Amino acid sequence: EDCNELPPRRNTEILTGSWSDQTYPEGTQAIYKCRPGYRSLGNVIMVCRKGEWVALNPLRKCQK
Amino acid sequence: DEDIIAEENIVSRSEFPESWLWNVEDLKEPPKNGISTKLMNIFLKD
Amino acid sequence: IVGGKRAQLGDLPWQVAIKDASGITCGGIYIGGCWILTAAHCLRASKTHRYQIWTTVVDWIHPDLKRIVIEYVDRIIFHENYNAGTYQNDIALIEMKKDGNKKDCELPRSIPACVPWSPYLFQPNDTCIVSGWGREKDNERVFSLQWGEVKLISNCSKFYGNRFYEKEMECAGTYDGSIDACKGDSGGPLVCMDANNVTYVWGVVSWGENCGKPEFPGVYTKVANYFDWISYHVGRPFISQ
Amino acid sequence: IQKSDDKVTLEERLDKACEPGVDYVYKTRLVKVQLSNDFDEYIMAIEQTIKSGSDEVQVGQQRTFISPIKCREALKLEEKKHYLMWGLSSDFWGEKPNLSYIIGKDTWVEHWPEEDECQDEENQKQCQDLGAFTESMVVFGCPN
Amino acid sequence: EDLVEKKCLAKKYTHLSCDKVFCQPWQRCIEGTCVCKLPYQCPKNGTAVCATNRRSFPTYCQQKSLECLHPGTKFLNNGTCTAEGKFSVSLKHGNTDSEGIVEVKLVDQDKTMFICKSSWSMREANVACLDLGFQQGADTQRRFKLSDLSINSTECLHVHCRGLETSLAECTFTKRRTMGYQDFADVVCYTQKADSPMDDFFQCVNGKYISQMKACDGINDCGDQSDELCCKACQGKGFHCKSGVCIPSQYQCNGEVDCITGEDEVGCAGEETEILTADMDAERRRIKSLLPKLSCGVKNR
Numbered sequence A: 001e002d003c004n005e006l007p008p009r010r011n012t013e014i015l016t017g018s019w020s021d022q023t024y025p026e027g028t029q030a031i032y033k034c035r036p037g038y039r040s041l042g043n044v045i046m047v048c049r050k051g052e053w054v055a056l057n058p059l060r061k062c063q064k
Numbered sequence B: 001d002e003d004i005i006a007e008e009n010i011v012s013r014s015e016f017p018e019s020w021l022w023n024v025e026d027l028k029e030p031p032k033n034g035i036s037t038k039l040m041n042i043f044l045k046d
Numbered sequence C: 001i002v003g004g005k006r007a008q009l010g011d012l013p014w015q016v017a018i019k020d021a022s023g024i025t026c027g028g029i030y031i032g033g034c035w036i037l038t039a040a041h042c043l044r045a046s047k048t049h050r051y052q053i054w055t056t057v058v059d060w061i062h063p064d065l066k067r068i069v070i071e072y073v074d075r076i077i078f079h080e081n082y083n084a085g086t087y088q089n090d091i092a093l094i095e096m097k098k099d100g101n102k103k104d105c106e107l108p109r110s111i112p113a114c115v116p117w118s119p120y121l122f123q124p125n126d127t128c129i130v131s132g133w134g135r136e137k138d139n140e141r142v143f144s145l146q147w148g149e150v151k152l153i154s155n156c157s158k159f160y161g162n163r164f165y166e167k168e169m170e171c172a173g174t175y176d177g178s179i180d181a182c183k184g185d186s187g188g189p190l191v192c193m194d195a196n197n198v199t200y201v202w203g204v205v206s207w208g209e210n211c212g213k214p215e216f217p218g219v220y221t222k223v224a225n226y227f228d229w230i231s232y233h234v235g236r237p238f239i240s241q
Numbered sequence D: 001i002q003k004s005d006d007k008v009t010l011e012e013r014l015d016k017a018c019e020p021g022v023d024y025v026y027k028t029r030l031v032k033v034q035l036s037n038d039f040d041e042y043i044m045a046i047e048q049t050i051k052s053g054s055d056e057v058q059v060g061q062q063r064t065f066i067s068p069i070k071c072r073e074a075l076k077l078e079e080k081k082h083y084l085m086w087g088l089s090s091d092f093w094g095e096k097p098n099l100s101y102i103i104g105k106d107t108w109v110e111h112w113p114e115e116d117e118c119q120d121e122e123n124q125k126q127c128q129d130l131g132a133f134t135e136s137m138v139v140f141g142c143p144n
Numbered sequence E: 001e002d003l004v005e006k007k008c009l010a011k012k013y014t015h016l017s018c019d020k021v022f023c024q025p026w027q028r029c030i031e032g033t034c035v036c037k038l039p040y041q042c043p044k045n046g047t048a049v050c051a052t053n054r055r056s057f058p059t060y061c062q063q064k065s066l067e068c069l070h071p072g073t074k075f076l077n078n079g080t081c082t083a084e085g086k087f088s089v090s091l092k093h094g095n096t097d098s099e100g101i102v103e104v105k106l107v108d109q110d111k112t113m114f115i116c117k118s119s120w121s122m123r124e125a126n127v128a129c130l131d132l133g134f135q136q137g138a139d140t141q142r143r144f145k146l147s148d149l150s151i152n153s154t155e156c157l158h159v160h161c162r163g164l165e166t167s168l169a170e171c172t173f174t175k176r177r178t179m180g181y182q183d184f185a186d187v188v189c190y191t192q193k194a195d196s197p198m199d200d201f202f203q204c205v206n207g208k209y210i211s212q213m214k215a216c217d218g219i220n221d222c223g224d225q226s227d228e229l230c231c232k233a234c235q236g237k238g239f240h241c242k243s244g245v246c247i248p249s250q251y252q253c254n255g256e257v258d259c260i261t262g263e264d265e266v267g268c269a270g271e272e273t274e275i276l277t278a279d280m281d282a283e284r285r286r287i288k289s290l291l292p293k294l295s296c297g298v299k300n301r
């Protein structure tokens, strides 16, 4: 909602990149990984398109 | 690939008993017109 | 201890009994080396050679004769600013004597219990366990070791008034539950586990008031306030600062 | 120990003050001397903690060093002066409310010259040895 | 919503208070206050370091401990000392002396380079103003925007600190490319003069004033962890300890106990950049690993 911080640390997911910065421009997608002990249809992708963090895959989540 | 469950996340069915649920239950519940109802939770096989 | 189950060998290793010539009075907790944390009012007897210390006590007037190891008492240490009227500063240390061949106490069964450094380590509504050689109901049932879960309650000045002091004491009791350590299990451990299941000594059984169900919870002298008192005597001990 | 007026080198100070008996090594300044009929008390403020032991320091606070009246004459301790003092852990005396230090049979007591005095050539040798001593003990210590 | 506690504020806890946070490896806990330990008491399993007085110390811990005892002896270079080596940080193109653009002259390289804006945060801000003469760290509410400044070079230094360091020589420094160089590190060191409230004071222990939203967010905006040791719940994405301290988000599953309770590192099942005087922040966590370990409260034998 103001891409000047790291992506929202999900409850049942984990990040995949290095993320050694703090402010990120231009559609910098954040591919989340399914935490061990959880299943999903694929990598949940979050995007920072200028103005806000958004979810690219709403209907996809990591179930037990 | 995309939009599919990974192989390692699929748990194959393996429980194929010809007979099971060889259990013993006692009807200790407060009777209702002499009938004591007992709710029993069981896990179905594969 | 009232409502609780029979302790068996593996459970609560930090429990230590102290037995006089006339039965068993109270009991302390082992925090490593050759030091024991008990209440000051119970052992204020200065007859140190006659005192006995038992570990892995299991179930009394039998035991497992194998690993029922007991150790003698070398030295007593009472809190100086201890008040007998208000039961403030009710804390004491016990130094166990060991033979000259092996230096320090080698106790391979009972596991030491860490010591808190800050009053903010544990908060009310936490699952704590009080265990000792106490009395259910009023029965002289100081034969079997009982343990039960209790919760810390905040602002105890509502129930006891002038007698309670939040800097140096702490209350543990169960809401609507009558499980309350009372009388015979004095000086015992008030043990609570953290997220890592590290075992801490939040308090030791100081005083109380004639058992009394969830009306008047048990009072324990808070250990975290006397962190510098224990550290001064035992030489910057086991736990990481 | 009165070990002075002899060959009081740097190795000697390091060797004596590094013995296992020696628990604490402090540099103190004599604030006030209350002379009494029973004991003598030297209220000193520990300016710097070269080696710490049982007593945990603040710098600014003061501690009283008690000594028998018979010893007053062997080392006239004057106020507003500094000293290098190290001692055993067996020289402790008090619970904590009145914790005093005993200048005992194993207590090293050497006069510490003032900063304007170290520029003088009579205190030159002692000043160089003492400054080095503090540095070596703090950073390097005793080999254990 | 009541995020700040009232009873804790009477004590004004700092990063030296044991009752909220762990001490540093070059410190022990005594009566709830981290006090400097002697240099010989540090563990001896490390690498040599250089201070500002061009004096060599056997390990990193002893240099910080002696700096703790005698303040001012900051850090310089990893390893042995250099004769002409000197570390300098300045502010260029500033309208006053308490603002401008960050420049760093490293002990290694003679060339003075600039800093990216992407790698700049509050952690490196307060440590920057500290060795510049501003005892109260950096200001959070005030930002220095350029006068449409033309920048010629493209070299940048990517910076990462912890927050409690005393100089920017301690932190890791990495050099990076930046096309066009739109990144631009700015800084506004806090200007003192005492005031009166209104204005959502949220007073620090050191005396600096910041906004409401800046406290209890996981960020050390005061410079001595004053807006973080007094929290009932964290504002942003900061994690909350049982004690009442808010830590950053990446402090979970990082290999270091942050809370005094330790609930941040439980259930944890979860790089071409190059060189320049090696990271001392990692050496801090390595020394903590060599602290007195031993059993207590262990289930197994």
Ligand SMILES: *[C@@H]1O[C@H](CO)[C@@H](O)[C@H](O)[C@H]1NC(C)=O
Residues within 6 Å of the ligand: C125, C151
């Ligand atoms: C926690 O404490 C509150 C009051 O502070 C109480 O209402 C609630 O029931 C407690 N919950 C538990 C699980 O003890």
Ligand SMILES: *[C@@H]1O[C@H](CO)[C@@H](O)[C@H](O)[C@H]1NC(C)=O
Residues within 6 Å of the ligand: C155, C157, C158
């Ligand atoms: C806390 O205890 C005091 C007794 O000293 C009592 O007056 C007060 O009502 C208690 N607090 C609450 C929230 O009830």
Ligand SMILES: *[C@@H]1O[C@H](CO)[C@@H](O)[C@H](O)[C@H]1NC(C)=O
Residues within 6 Å of the ligand: C193, C194, C195, C196, C197
């Ligand atoms: C101890 O660990 C176990 C997990 O096996 C679980 O009971 C819990 O996470 C821990 N206990 C407490 C009281 O936190």
Ligand SMILES: *[C@@H]1O[C@H](CO)[C@@H](O)[C@H](O)[C@H]1NC(C)=O
Residues within 6 Å of the ligand: E045, E046
């Ligand atoms: C430091 O690590 C271990 C002890 O932790 C030591 O044996 C080793 O020799 C040291 N490292 C080096 C490079 O000497």
Ligand SMILES: *[C@@H]1O[C@H](CO)[C@@H](O)[C@H](O)[C@H]1NC(C)=O
Residues within 6 Å of the ligand: E046, E047, E078, E079, E278, E279, E283
């Ligand atoms: C610099 O310090 C790091 C960490 O202490 C160490 O790994 C490295 O070997 C050092 N470099 C030199 C040249 O000593």
Ligand SMILES: *[C@@H]1O[C@H](CO)[C@@H](O)[C@H](O)[C@H]1NC(C)=O
Residues within 6 Å of the ligand: E152, E153
């Ligand atoms: C920046 O400086 C370099 C070196 O002086 C020069 O080659 C380059 O043309 C300059 N760029 C601009 C845009 O002036």
Ligand SMILES: [Ca+2]
Residues within 6 Å of the ligand: E214, E215, E216, E217, E218, E219, E220, E221, E222, E227, E228
């Ligand atoms: Ca903050």
Ligand SMILES: [Ca+2]
Residues within 6 Å of the ligand: E251, E252, E253, E254, E255, E256, E257, E258, E264, E265
């Ligand atoms: Ca952590």
